[PDB]
Design a protein around this ligand. Structure first.
Ligand SMILES: [Mn+2]
Ligand SMILES: [Mn+2]
Length: 177
């Protein structure tokens, strides 16, 4: 009935010391469309405790691949791989050939895995989010509900709304499943 019971959300929950130690990065990108924004996400993954930690984000309603590229490079986030929304193959091309993000690549998994990717995140021991670092990830994950069906009963799919960092996280971890 209520998803992501595993959330840990508090301002300051991730210190700068911790961020420095994080050495197992996963990054994802949803591209945005119409009213929907571009969402880049960067996480650290603790496989031995089954937890993920939100390190940084970029959410942008006025979608600019240049600006997204400038941000990734400015912060030195291009040493790590980015798994991107594969519905925009030319946006992926552009980041790579146009803007120098060499380690960007398309989500291999299809639209018949959303449900499973969402379950995988949901079954993590903990999803740790500092709203001072990643406030959009915090808002989305905190407020996202399950879709309800014809009757009004809940179903195993998250709402397809205000879920851009969620999607982006799903892409980021798709090889870890
Ligand atoms: Mn998308
Ligand atoms: Mn989206």
């Amino acid at each position: 009935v209520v998803p992501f019971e595993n959330l840990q959300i508090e301002e300051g929950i991730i210190t700068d010391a911790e961020v420095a130690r994080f050495d197992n990065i996963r990054q994802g990108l949803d591209f945005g469309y119409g009213p929907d924004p571009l969402a880049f996400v960067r996480w650290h993954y603790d496989k031995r405790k089954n937890r993920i930690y939100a390190i940084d984000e970029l959410v942008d309603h006025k979608v600019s691949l240049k600006r997204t590229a400038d941000f990734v490079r400015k912060n030195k986030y291009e040493s790590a791989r980015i798994i991107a929304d594969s519905s925009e193959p030319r946006s992926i091309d552009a980041l790579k050939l146009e803007h120098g993000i060499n380690r960007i690549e398309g989500a291999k998994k299809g639209p018949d895995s959303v449900e499973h990717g969402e379950r995988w995140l949901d079954e993590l021991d903990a999803i740790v989010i500092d709203p001072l670092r990643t406030p959009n990830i915090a808002r989305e994950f905190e407020n996202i509900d399950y879709q309800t069906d014809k009757n009004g009963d809940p179903i195993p799919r998250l709402e397809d709304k205000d879920n851009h960092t969620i999607d982006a996280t799903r892409y980021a971890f798709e090889r870890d499943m």
